[model samples]
Target: HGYMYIPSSRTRLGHEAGIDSCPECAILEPVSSWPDLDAAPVGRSGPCGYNARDSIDYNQPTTNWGSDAVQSYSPGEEIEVQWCVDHNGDHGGMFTYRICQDQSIVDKFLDPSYLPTNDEKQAAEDCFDAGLLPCTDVSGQECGYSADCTEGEACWRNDWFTCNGFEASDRPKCQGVDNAELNSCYTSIAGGYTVTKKVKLPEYTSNHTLISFKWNSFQTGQIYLSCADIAIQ
Candidate 1:
């Protein structure tokens, strides 16, 4: 129910433009998302994500997306980023933004006709995980662990941003993090709230690169994924 918006991800653009049939419907399920950050295998989702709703694989450049950079930033620049969560689909978990350091693998995603193999997808994902732009990397950013994450658990890291108290009845889950109005971002079924954050870009450059978003739900055994095209100068 959530996806990156500031850099303009493929799903976001596709959904906003009425190209992606079901933008907010990519889901990776039947996996343990808590206390085990690396437990599940990405499988067919790839690092860029596979949206089965429209039978679209974001890892591949499509007619409406992935051909050009929606936005660009300088290496080591501190920037404001945003993503949207559906009013009804906010699962109140943790999320992270990433850039894969391996250009060879990323090039496969930039190719319009090439559908990367499963091995390539995993290689890209591993690289992405290692190249995380931790929330703590940015100044004035509130980087903290998810309420569901125990200090000694594998999910203890605060490098990723977390939602509000997972079980606050009054204002719970990611919906409680901000009061941004629904429809602030694109959602297929219901309106959504926009969540904003600051991130410090790593010292890297690429003419054609990808920045991916990942969200693991605390309420359900599911995960959401998406990616945006970016150029780091």
Candidate 2:
């Protein structure tokens, strides 16, 4: 449905001239989608996510995205980031941005020729779940839980950023949250809308840190994923 753009995710950079691929293709689907965020495991999609469309595994460095830092920041710096959603698959959902601080596992992903196994990918993802950068961590962010989430359940956590209230029939998806212009960012389909949010980097440093992106859909058995390359000081 959507992929991170501000920090220039591997999937987003894939949309460039040489790769010109679909960023929207990076999806983990045909599984449990809402109520319990853990209803379905992330599988091999991992912390960096995967693109089924192009058969690309994002954990490994790519020609376009992983070689250089899209934006540099120091520990505790709060910055705005964006994800572009398709005009069509604007499934209302909740999302999060994460940074896995474990340098050992991260090093494997930094190597372009190395592909983490399915187990390794999920292990990396589990770490990201623990290190997720909460929406409230950023000042004034409109952090909210999916209305579909059963209170007292796993999905009740507000750390995941909401596109719109699940019950807000008035607001269909991420686009309704911002009413962004169709071409706000990039999508392979009918165009897209930019959903923006700010997040604070943790007290860590990495010349090759990664920002993992995840969005779980409330209306379908699906979740979208992607990751951006960045540096932290």
Candidate 3:
């Protein structure tokens, strides 16, 4: 079937419900490490399972090329891009592009779904080191650990690890608050049962050019961003 849905905390549940609560609905487990997928690895498993990315159609000459593309672009991009319906005859959907001076740096902007800035990465490390949340000032920085904050005081999760309420496999970091049941048990980076603030974008540079872009689009549609090799002018 040619279809895909952005993985949310309850995506599997939502899909099951939409499919008439079929008990046979497949539940994908999160792959560990920086790059993981809902389906079996193309070589390791021998075939794509029911993962969301598997539904994409990108007809290409080789599986290696195709797989690399998905892994590289799955999280999507932010700027200086093109909209190709399909690369080698496959129909395409929502997609985007980015501009970077060095292709090596392109990786930094390609996958936005789970990419973290230095601060977020550090906060996560701190949360794990202390085995608890941090003291968030009005601005929500890591002033200290949970020990420093009062009981029942809102523990601001500058990153996902702090909200130890949800399952790590679910990958709810920075994801919105929608599932009331699951959300009640855990507060998201978005916060206590509702999203307050907006998503922020980082600045990018390409030699003499400085570029920045933001994703104002928020919905249930498929979207991605890619970049033409970085140009220096």
Candidate 4:
């Protein structure tokens, strides 16, 4: 038949960095704008725009890492549009990762009627009510409910729980308790870390969809998990 452009890679740094690291690697150097005629939106070049290499190419660029791996990648859908850390020494750097899916497959597999935003929002609220940290913003900061946060520890004014306003050491109030336990809970468990959770589509039309797991950290960081299967129903 034909070759499949499945973007996959494996390396120590890349593995540790996770899929989000792909975009970071792409941006290290300007994305080649030599126009991939085969790519859609002509003159689009690559996902990073200016010049970006596929996950495979990015992994091979430096020998500093080793191994090669591949997994399902989707831009904006399968993979969420988000930002992650790029450790540069004691300080950290910020970068964006855009995972695009094979539109053809997505158009076939995804239900056009399902809206993820609203569902995610409702889920976040439900999680807060249930005492579990609902999914935070892409940044993994902010909580949907004030009760989900600690007092003194400010919640981001942004629409989504997009930024954590407290420091790792700051103590805020949540559920009549100081922010320490909440903070520790987040850092130790749901602290903006990524995990694989399978969510059941509305009406249970779809079996279960696995998504890249991430939660905004109370600290200035984002937690990313490897490909994990989440069962939602």
Best-matching candidate per lDDT: 1
lDDT of each: 0.83, 0.81, 0.22, 0.23
In model 1, where is the ten-residue run with the lowest total lDDT?
Answer: 164-173
Per-residue error for 133 in candidate 4, Å, reads 13
Error of 1 at 222 (Å): 1.0
How much is 41 displaced in model 4, in angstroms?
Answer: 12
What digit string (tens of lDDT, one per residue) describes model 3 on residues 66-107?
112221221112211211111111111111111222333333
Clashing pairs in 1: none
After TM-score superposition, the amount by which residue 20's alpha carbon in candidate 3 deviates from its true location, in angstroms, is 18
The better-scoring model by lDDT among 2 and 4 is: 2
Which segments of model 4 are wrong by more than 4 Å? 1-159, 166-233
Pairs clashing within candidate 2: none
The superposed Cα distance between candidate 1 and the true structure at residue 95, in angstroms, equals 0.3
What TM-scores do the predictions have? 0.95, 0.93, 0.22, 0.25
lDDT of 4 by residue, 1-233 (tens): 00001122222234345432233222222212111111112122112111133343221123332221233322222332222223221111111111112222222213333323333322322332232212332343323333334434434222222322233234221112121222221111122111121111122111322222222222222222211112222
lDDT of 1 by residue, 1-233 (tens): 77778889988878876767667787777777766766677878887777777877888887889998888899999987888888789988888889998898799999888999989888888999988888999877778777887888888888988887766657677877676777887777787788888888889999789998888788888778899999999
RMSD of 1: 1.4
Cα lDDT of candidate 3 equals 0.22
What does candidate 2 score on TM? 0.93
lDDT of 2 at 233: 72
Off by over 4 Å in 1: none
TM-score, cand. 3: 0.22
**Which model scores highest in TM-score?**
1
